[PDB]
């Protein structure tokens, strides 16, 4: 029952995660810039459903994730999928201060989030995470590590299969420290930056919980059509 993820070096771990990165998708190209409440949520939930398909292919390409059982893989994705979508959104929005890059052709500021009630709250939390990632000078190699950590950790306490996940989590921790020491950070800066990055994941969890509740109320409004896959990921939180 041994896995090949624990034998990879820190450099081999960085390369495997980078080559597994999902593509950047687009939204509908209708030039009607004034959005209605249903128009914006329709474009966002359509993009989330399409990005979710690539996330599942990214998950299988995460070192160690293929070694879990089918049911363990389902549990990890079911609880972490919104966090992974959010940290991916926050990462693309780094070089766009005050704006969220949902897609290259769908860049939105916080004033446009007022079109949907309850969305401006989550909007501000996402913008705040980009500012932190921007002011921390978050690198792409650190980002792919934080996203895999979310996948493996978010549902690990809701299950020796748990030991395998904790061994891969320790592997990514070695990979993160290896990246920081490679950049010239001292020993004190390594564990400090390690702590600062991991504490942001606690807030990404908070945005997911606030956003998962907001997605449940729109199912109860039945105004913006949600895909069956998005509904099954949403039902897993109740």
């Amino acid at each position: 029952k041994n896995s090949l993820a624990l034998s990879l070096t820190a450099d081999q771990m960085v390369s495997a995660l980078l080559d597994a990165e999902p593509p950047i998708l687009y939204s509908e190209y209708d030039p009607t810039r004034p959005f209605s409440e249903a128009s914006m949520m329709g474009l966002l939930t359509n993009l989330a459903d399409r990005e979710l398909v690539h996330m599942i292919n990214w998950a299988k390409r995460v070192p160690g994730f293929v070694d879990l059982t089918l049911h363990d893989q389902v549990h990890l994705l079911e609880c972490a999928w919104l966090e992974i979508l959010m940290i991916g959104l926050v990462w693309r929005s780094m070089e766009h201060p005050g704006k969220l890059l949902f897609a290259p052709n769908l860049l939105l500021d916080r004033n446009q989030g007022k079109c949907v009630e309850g969305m401006v709250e989550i909007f501000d939390m996402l913008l705040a995470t980009s500012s932190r990632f921007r002011m921390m000078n978050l690198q792409g190699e650190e980002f792919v590590c934080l996203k895999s950590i979310i996948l493996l950790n978010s549902g690990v306490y809701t299950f020796e299969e748990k030991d395998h996940i904790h061994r891969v989590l320790d592997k990514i921790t070695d990979t993160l420290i290896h990246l920081m020491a490679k950049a010239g950070l001292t020993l004190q800066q390594q564990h400090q930056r390690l702590a600062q990055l991991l504490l942001i994941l606690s807030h990404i969890r908070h945005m997911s919980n606030k956003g998962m509740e907001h997605l449940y109320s729109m199912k109860c409004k039945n105004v913006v059509p949600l895909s069956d896959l998005l509904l099954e990921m949403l039902d897993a939180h109740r």
Partner: peptide, 11 residues
């Protein structure tokens, strides 16, 4: 149970 997630993970 029948889940779309099961099919997407197996393919």
């Amino acid at each position: 149970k029948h889940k779309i997630l099961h099919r997407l993970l197996q393919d």
